[PDB]
Amino acid sequence: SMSVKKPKRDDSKDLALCSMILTEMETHEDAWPFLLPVNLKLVPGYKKVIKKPMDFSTIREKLSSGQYPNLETFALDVRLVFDNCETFNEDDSDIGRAGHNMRKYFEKKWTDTFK
Ligand SMILES: CC(=O)c1cccc(O)c1
């Protein structure tokens, strides 16, 4: 509260560490469904169903331009990618499996890096 401060995380390396995690996700072999925005003109139903599209290239642009105020907003956008994937794809499809795989991959890097 006012004039009563908690000790807080050293956050000075957060930007660089998130960038490294994102690089590891960008280069994963199962990243291909998530590298670019889904083409809303070519993919029936996506525009109406998925209220907040997100993809790795949009996250990278946002990270490179100071649009994440903290590491938690970065993780929210990453998770949104996989939450969207689950919404639109069956678990046993190729894209569906890729999403589960990439989510697992992310969360381990996230825990190992920050928790
Ligand atoms: C990420 C996703 O949900 C996707 C990507 C390409 C084609 C498609 O139908 C869906």
From Swiss-Prot:
<feature type="domain" description="Bromo">
    <location>
        <begin position="9"/>
        <end position="113"/>
    </location>
</feature>
<protein>
    <recommendedName>
        <fullName>Bromodomain adjacent to zinc finger domain protein 2B</fullName>
    </recommendedName>
</protein>
<comment type="function">
    <text>Regulatory subunit of the ATP-dependent BRF-1 and BRF-5 ISWI chromatin remodeling complexes, which form ordered nucleosome arrays on chromatin and facilitate access to DNA during DNA-templated processes such as DNA replication, transcription, and repair. Both complexes regulate the spacing of nucleosomes along the chromatin and have the ability to slide mononucleosomes to the center of a DNA template. The BRF-1 ISWI chromatin remodeling complex has a lower ATP hydrolysis rate than the BRF-5 ISWI chromatin remodeling complex.</text>
</comment>
<comment type="similarity">
    <text>Belongs to the WAL family.</text>
</comment>
<comment type="subunit">
    <text>Component of the BRF-1 ISWI chromatin remodeling complex, at least composed of SMARCA1 and BAZ2B, which regulates the spacing of histone octamers on the DNA template to facilitate access to DNA. Within the BRF-1 ISWI chromatin remodeling complex interacts with SMARCA1; the interaction is direct. Component of the BRF-5 ISWI chromatin remodeling complex, at least composed of SMARCA5/SNF2H and BAZ2B, which regulates the spacing of histone octamers on the DNA template to facilitate access to DNA.</text>
</comment>
